[PDB]
Design a protein around this ligand. Structure first.
Ligand SMILES: *C(=O)[C@H]([C@@H](C)O)[C@@]1(C)CC(S[C@@H]2CN[C@H](C(=O)N(C)C)C2)=C(C(=O)O)N1
Length: 246
């Protein structure tokens, strides 16, 4: 009789990242319990630049301090943008889905360096340091945050427990819906800091199960330029299925 290799979800998710030849961690939180998966668990408590995951907090700060509203159409004023898909007028929510950096740079400059630093420190997000460059501090430093801190943050958002008004948190959640089917909802925000070394990739969000249970997640991995952006979504969805969260 031969031996049989027994693949549990811990081993499977570890090998998902190995198969992509990179280091990654997946942080899961539900019922105030955090579990770590992937092939590089030390990443969970390591600080990285948040990249576009910071758009969640940018939106919260801008709406709470009445620098914008959910119906405002941010105009494309004619510069060549990184993607043709971004060259249009759009709302905060559409810019969230597209990760349209110039919309959130315009918002960050409305907030201003002083109010932004104060609010980031009030929330206590990551190292809570934004430096002197108001339009890129989440992309190239100095702001950094751990994956555990991101799962804690996004779980509070999902439960309307952040120190913001309830309506503002509800509105930002609505900007983050990615998928609905069979009574499940998946919310989240990607990030990819391409201009630092090593590059860092994020997918932070939560699943609402059909009975209303919230299972939050923060995927964090080393990126390389040859990777398709969808690698983050692929690794997340395969892992969530292995964990029976979806
Ligand atoms: C934010 O993390 C990052 C920097 C430049 O602010 C950004 C915008 C780069 C990418 S990858 C690329 C950008 N938008 C593409 C896309 O998915 N759409 C819908 C056009 C992919 C991201 C990202 O994680 O998506 N953010």
């Amino acid at each position: 009789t031969p031996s049989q290799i027994v693949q549990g979800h811990n081993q499977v998710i570890h090998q998902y990242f190995d198969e992509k030849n990179t280091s990654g961690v997946l942080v899961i939180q539900t019922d105030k319990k955090i579990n770590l998966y992937g092939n590089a668990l030390s990443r969970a408590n390591t600080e990285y630049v948040p990249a576009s995951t910071f758009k969640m907090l940018n939106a919260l700060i801008g709406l709470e301090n009445q620098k914008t509203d959910i119906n405002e159409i941010f105009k494309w004023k004619g510069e060549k943008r990184s993607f043709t898909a971004w060259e249009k007028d759009m709302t905060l929510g559409e810019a969230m889905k597209l990760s349209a950096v110039p919309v959130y740079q315009e918002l960050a400059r409305r907030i201003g360096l002083d109010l932004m630093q104060k609010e980031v420190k009030r929330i206590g997000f990551g190292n809570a340091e934004i430096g002197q460059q108001v339009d890129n501090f989440w992309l190239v430093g100095p702001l950094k945050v751990t994956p555990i801190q991101e799962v804690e943050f996004v779980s509070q958002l999902a439960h309307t427990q952040l120190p913001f008004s309830e309506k503002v948190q509800a509105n930002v959640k609505n900007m983050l819906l990615l998928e609905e089917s069979n009574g499940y909802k998946i919310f989240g925000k990607t990030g990819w800091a391409m201009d630092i070394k090593p590059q860092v990739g994020w997918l932070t969000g939560w699943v609402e199960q059909p009975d209303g249970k919230i299972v939050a997640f923060a995927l964090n991995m080393e990126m390389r330029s040859e990777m398709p952006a969808s690698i983050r979504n692929e690794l997340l969805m395969k892992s969530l299925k292995q964990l029976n969260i979806i």
